[PDB]
Amino acid sequence: SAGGIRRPIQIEEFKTAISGMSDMELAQIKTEIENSINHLQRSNARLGKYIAKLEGASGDLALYKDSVRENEIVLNNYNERVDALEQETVYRKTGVDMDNSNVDVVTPNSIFI
Amino acid sequence: AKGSTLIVVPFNQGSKQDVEALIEFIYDTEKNGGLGWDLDAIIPFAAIP
Amino acid sequence: RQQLQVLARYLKMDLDNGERKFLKEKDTVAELQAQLDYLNAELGEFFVN
């Protein structure tokens, strides 16, 4: 699918495209993005080790730092795209009177005549 | 107008007891908790359709 | 008296259950009688008979 393609996509164009799809297509995209999230989080775990190993000891440290900084920009797009999946999902679970006040029967005419 | 008064009472024409009590309530003295009046006119227009 | 009481408690037997239901019904007697006494007054003895 064109949604969740391992690279960051603009949200407003996703927020429209998500509307005109089938429910099984949304579940396929939702599965695909979560796999993409686990791919970056296991990537950031590996980048986290190479930070903590060298932080214990400044060339080839800033290059690890902007690599995990860049992954947070792409990951910020993923859970924003997952947030649009949640909002599209929840839109599809909506779609005696003795006073002569009423009838003035003191008068001969009021009865029905 | 001057000298005019109006009294509203809840009332059931249907009930015997209410009729007897109402007439007593008009003519009984103020000191026994009445009006102490004497009627000059009766207009019994009440009825149902 | 006390020896009886503890056995009644053991049997989960309520001694006063009768009188409770008795007191309840005589309250409804007075209630129906009050409604009866009213209509006798509103119609007169002769009318009802």
Nearest to A68 by CA among A57, A79, A52, A82: A52
**Interface residue of C35, C38, C39, C42 to substitute, partner B, most B CBs within 10 Å:** C42
- Per domain, the residue ranges of chain C are 1-44
* Sign of the dihedral defined by the CA atoms of residues C38, C41, C43, C49, in that order: positive
Determine A/C contact with 3+ CB pairs under 8 A as the test. Answer: no
The answer to whether residue B16 neighbours chain C at the CB level (below 8 Å) is yes
CATH of domain C1-44: 6.10.250.1930
Q: What is the CA radius of gyration of chain B?
A: 13
- CB contacts of A108 in chain B (<8 Å) are none
d(CA A36, CA A43): 11
Residues in B closer than 8 angstroms to C42, CB to CB, are 15-17
Whether B15 and chain C come into contact, CB under 8 Å, resolves to: yes
CB A14 within 8 A of CB A29: no
Is there a contact between C41 and B15 if contact means CB atoms under 8 Å apart? no
> Are residues A36 and A71 in contact, defined by beta-carbon separation less than 8 angstroms?
no
The answer to whether the beta carbons of residues B2 and B30 sit under 8 Å apart is: no
What's the sign of the alpha-carbon dihedral B23, B24, B27, B31?
A: negative
**What values do phi and psi take at A61, rounded to 5?**
-125, -40
Task: Output the CA torsion sign for A43, A47, A52, A53.
Answer: positive
